[PDB]
């Protein structure tokens, strides 16, 4: 676990000075000795290599993650398998794709065995090519790429969309819109949009291009997008929304236009964020099983880092929908 280097950093001296103190050099300022000795005791540094190696090794895993809540459960899920697998977790918050890609080349100088679990809200194509570099195998969690060379553990977004929209239809709505995150992202253009379309097709419903409004993942775009849809000639009576945060906007814009949300306009969102229970018509919304996704992820990774069979990439766990008050 612990090197000369670790000690020298911690006591703010050079490696050569930690050795000097390890070797009992007598002309080391004794304040220096003192601090270097306490750092040694404190960190648990042994000067004997055969002992230092004996206390250590064991198979470790980097985890790159944006950590509010639905992120936390994904963590717990990973942590819980590391724990019984007796592996170790390097966790690290990264948000900016610049922060994201450093962490990659970053913990990429990891340690014994090694492998990496990655989760981002979308994919850099850069990202698809840095993953492929790293010798250690990478598993995507709650992240897709269309780059289906990267093993991924997620829900079925397209079916989850489909399922979100189906409940609207089962409830009598003909005129149902979608409010998406940035379409460029495959969660959107390639899944929730498909599932939304298909839900409409399979019940022989019109698939208007104007019922599909693109937001930016903020609460406002959410608000803007309702303004737009509410200006349509025949207005939607129900709206699927690609994330919760935008959906709070959509409920609120409607409530600002005098519309009762269940009664004039049913709304459903995605992920089951803290916010879904922080609006008043409480947002019925799609629950990913994030604990499982991180667990199953960690296992997947493991079956790679050990080199074995089974199907990757297409690991899709089930989702469900928490029906709350923003549907009838």
UniProtKB/Swiss-Prot annotation:
<dbReference type="InterPro" id="IPR000843">
    <property type="entry name" value="HTH_LacI"/>
</dbReference>
<dbReference type="InterPro" id="IPR028082">
    <property type="entry name" value="Peripla_BP_I"/>
</dbReference>
<protein>
    <recommendedName>
        <fullName>Catabolite control protein A</fullName>
    </recommendedName>
</protein>
<dbReference type="InterPro" id="IPR010982">
    <property type="entry name" value="Lambda_DNA-bd_dom_sf"/>
</dbReference>
<dbReference type="GO" id="GO:0003700">
    <property type="term" value="F:DNA-binding transcription factor activity"/>
</dbReference>
<keyword id="KW-0804">Transcription</keyword>
<feature type="DNA-binding region" description="H-T-H motif">
    <location>
        <begin position="4"/>
        <end position="23"/>
    </location>
</feature>
<dbReference type="Pfam" id="PF00356">
    <property type="entry name" value="LacI"/>
</dbReference>
<keyword id="KW-0238">DNA-binding</keyword>
<keyword id="KW-0010">Activator</keyword>
<feature type="domain" description="HTH lacI-type">
    <location>
        <begin position="1"/>
        <end position="56"/>
    </location>
</feature>
<keyword id="KW-0678">Repressor</keyword>
<keyword id="KW-0805">Transcription regulation</keyword>
<dbReference type="GO" id="GO:0000976">
    <property type="term" value="F:transcription cis-regulatory region binding"/>
</dbReference>
<dbReference type="InterPro" id="IPR046335">
    <property type="entry name" value="LacI/GalR-like_sensor"/>
</dbReference>
<dbReference type="Pfam" id="PF13377">
    <property type="entry name" value="Peripla_BP_3"/>
</dbReference>
<dbReference type="InterPro" id="IPR006377">
    <property type="entry name" value="CcpA"/>
</dbReference>
<comment type="function">
    <text>Global transcriptional regulator of carbon catabolite repression (CCR) and carbon catabolite activation (CCA), which ensures optimal energy usage under diverse conditions.</text>
</comment>
